[PDB]
Point group: C2
Chain length 111, copies 2
């Protein structure tokens, strides 16, 4: 199978921008899609990015996703940071007969 | 556009069976796959059921998923609970352009 590795945490000031990486153990990250969901403390997840780089109904232009073939790592970017963005972020990826999750990154907004 | 409702929590003794429900507000719960994942206390999510009722390799058969057309809901059943099963459980389903998560169920094991 495969693993997705993310940094334990990221932090930034309001209005600033952050980038969360999601690396793949084996196989080309492009092989399969990558999703991203936001989970505010003590709460239920909500998708912020899909199809590796799409934004579901409602999610602000502030969120965006990409995929670096050379590094084999997808990344979630949040610009124009707002206090409400403080949450844990997880990348999701698929494998025949299985859904894999990243370790998750805790974003702390310093304002 | 729809919502997935699950009980807030459940607490049972080891050896017993529990049924975490995931009822979908609107839309046929069959037109899309339902996945279930487990998230330990301070841990990253892992899939326990893929595509309605498939159990990914490694997950104990005490875990089972089902879909009930008439009640337009899905269920995660755990037979013969073990303390190791204590965790938050979330159902997930889909729609045209988005992934929807259930609210989550905190299962506590009294052993």
């Amino acid at each position: 199978n495969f693993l997705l590795t993310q940094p334990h945490s990221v932090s930034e000031s309001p209005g600033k921008t952050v980038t969360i990486s999601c690396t793949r153990s084996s196989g080309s990250i492009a092989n399969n899609y990558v999703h991203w969901y936001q989970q505010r403390p003590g709460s239920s997840p909500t998708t912020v990015i899909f199809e590796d780089d799409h934004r579901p109904s409602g999610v602000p232009d502030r969120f965006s996703g990409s995929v670096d073939t050379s590094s084999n790592s997808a990344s979630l970017t949040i610009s124009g940071l707002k206090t409400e963005d403080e949450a844990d972020y997880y990348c999701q990826s698929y494998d025949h007969n299985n859904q894999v999750f990243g370790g998750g990154t805790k974003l702390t907004v310093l304002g």
